[PDB]
Structure 1
């Protein structure tokens, strides 16, 4: 996250870190046994880390649970990033408490102008590299579809939205991928792609979760 603030320990209780020996992507806990992340974060050998603040220090609220199954969306296209969503099942249920909690799926799609919270452990610089050890947060609005399409001609599908600031300076960045965009207490987006980080006229692009609720629910019910 570029241009954000330190969230505070366990203030974003649905945020997970995906670990394969190191943090590589975020995700969101949607019930005690399932996480949703970006398809472009797929790999084998995932451990899900819940209850994290500092990802390099054991602070006492963590739960570390291996994945048993990963399911990339049937129509994910790695060239265009259309349908950039995946589900991860945990080998055992997490223990839910005030610091480790699920986030609700939306019943309706959010409109442009709605303010959302984006979080992650990704790079904090737009030029160069500095990775934080504690969770960072950013408040940002959903942008109109017309502004999003004007920023990225030919690249925005109905399964994407833009959020952030056209003036630059505040955005998600490398290592934030897969993490949550929460608006009015519901999961509306997944950190997906962008051109650089925090550049003028190049806002972040997010997977539009409201289009996937039926697939999520049906997949969980049968796996």
Structure 2
């Protein structure tokens, strides 16, 4: 997260990180006691999942292994269309004050909407700086018509764009797969943008979650 600030404590209880060892690989969100949603480009053979603390490495955090994960079948490695994946926890998260399910959307929030994206990703770019503390930053949804001016053929109608005009405020390496939430609901998963991070007027791009709820529900149901 570039040009952001520490998340207020205990207010991102649905945020997780996917770790490789004790090293951050991706962000993600808790859908339920069994499942984490995150980006497809985070796929690994095995994951260690951190839940229930704004601070990485916290004594109080839960660490659960996840040995199985399920990418959206329409995911493209070449173009990153359909960049989402469900991650099955090897055991059920203990829900608590610091561990809640995210509110999945029932609606696509429109352009102009104010959102918060959260993550333990680099706070600088290209020179990297990693925070223990979960960082948050507010951006507005940006219309396909506006975002296509910048990115053209790269965009799908299931990708959602967000930023602030003339603003470095954005996500970055480590934030991948993590929550963009707007008006209480999960509206995006951090997918891609430009390098280095935080170039003014290059919006961050997100998997638009409101277009994949059927898949998310069917897949959890199918893999009960």
TM-score after normalising by structure 1: 0.96
Alignment partner, residue 46 of structure 2: 45
Unaligned stretches of 5+ residues in structure 1: none
1:52-201 map, 5 Å: 52-56=53-57, 58-60=58-60, 62-196=61-195, 197-201=197-201
Alpha-carbon distance, 1:98 to partner:
1.2
- The answer on whether the counterparts of 2:29 and 2:37 sit within 8 Å (CA) in structure 1 is yes
Alpha-carbon distance, 1:91 to partner:
1.2
Alignment partner, residue 8 of structure 1: 8
1:27-46 map, 5 Å: 27-46=28-47
1:110-157, CA deviations, whole angstroms, 9 ceiling, x for partnerless residues? Answer: 100111110000111134221111100001110111111001011110
The 3-state SS of whatever aligns with 1:152 is helix
Unaligned stretches of 5+ residues in structure 2: none
TM-score after normalising by structure 2: 0.95
Alignment partner, residue 206 of structure 1: 206
- The answer on whether the counterparts of 1:168 and 1:203 sit within 8 Å (CA) in structure 2 is no
* Alpha-carbon distance in structure 2 between the residues aligned to 1:63 and 1:126: 30
The Cα RMSD (Å) is: 1.1
